Structure formats: C-alpha cells, structure tokens
C-alpha cells in the first residue's frame, strides 16, 4: 500500500496531543496523515497533510530523525513529532468536506489498546474511537519517555 505521513502533534506541556476527526469510513479521531504523492519526499507530504486537515504548518517544526513509524498490514505510517505547539493555536482545516472537529486529548487518558469483549465470551475488539491513534500511543509514550524523562 502507498505510504502515509503525518504528525503528532504535543502542546507545550507534553501532556495533550492533537487529534482529527473524519467522516464515515475516518468517522474517528486519529493523528492528522494522508497518502504521499508520486516524486513528494516524506517530510513535504506531512506538512501537506497536516496543513490540508488543521490548517497548521509544521515544516519549520519538522526533525528529521523525530517521529514514530508503524507497519499494519503492509502499509507504513510514519508521524513526525512535533512538541511544543501552544494549546491556543487556531486550527482549522481546508479540507472541511473531510474533517469534522479538531481537538486536544490528554495523552495520559487515550487508551492504548481496545477492550476484548470477555465480559460477554465473543471474540475480538470492542469499538473504540481512537482505533487509528491507538497503536501510536505506547510508542509515543516510551519515545517521550526517552526523549524528556
Ligand atoms: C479507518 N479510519 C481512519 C481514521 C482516521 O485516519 N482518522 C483521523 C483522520 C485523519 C485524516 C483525515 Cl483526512 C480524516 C480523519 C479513522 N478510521
């Protein structure tokens, strides 16, 4: 599958993290990614991304060695970290026909995996609206861990 790039973007506390919105098939919150075009280098096409969902431009922001990149199902995703963003930061995307809501959540409160549904004896993973942040979360932590303390 074609690659995806985007950010996670933290507010100056390092507590909060900024997450968007979608419709339908993307009706739950996750990091703001996108595909990258032919001949677009990654950091370019997070900043497209990003700027196109929230309206903020991380390319002065963007370290190259900074970001956390998971493989699900044969497609990569990488995010660039990108601390520090105020918390009064205005965001607002172009893609309006594509972003419903834009928001801060506390990173200490996000789940890190789905709930099994043992409480009832079936299979799987309990809905959750965080499914696509999900699997970024332990990785972030341990990564602000090691990078802050
Ligand atoms: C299958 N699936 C994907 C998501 C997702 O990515 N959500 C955040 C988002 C990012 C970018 C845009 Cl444009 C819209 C929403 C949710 N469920």
Redesign the pocket.
């Known amino acids: 599958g074609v690659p995806t790039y ?1 950010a996670i973007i933290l507010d100056e506390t390092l507590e909060n993290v900024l ?5 339908l ?10 595909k990258v075009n032919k001949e677009e280098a990654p950091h370019d096409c997070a900043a497209r ?1 990003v700027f ?2 929230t309206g903020f431009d991380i390319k002065d922001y963007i370290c190259k060695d900074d970001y956390i990149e998971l493989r699900i199902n044969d497609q990569l995703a990488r995010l660039y970290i990108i601390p520090g963003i105020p918390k009064d930061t205005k965001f607002n995307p172009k ?1 309006r026909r ?2 419903r809501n834009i928001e801060w959540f506390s990173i200490e409160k996000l789940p890190c995996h789905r709930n099994d549904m043992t409480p009832k004896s079936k299979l799987g993973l309990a809905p959750n609206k965080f ?2 942040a999900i699997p970024f979360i332990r990785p972030l932590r341990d990564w602000l861990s090691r990078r802050f303390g």
């Open positions: 985007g997450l968007v919105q979608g419709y098939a993307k009706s739950g919150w996750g990091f703001p990614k996108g991304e196109e969902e893609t594509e972003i499914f696509m």
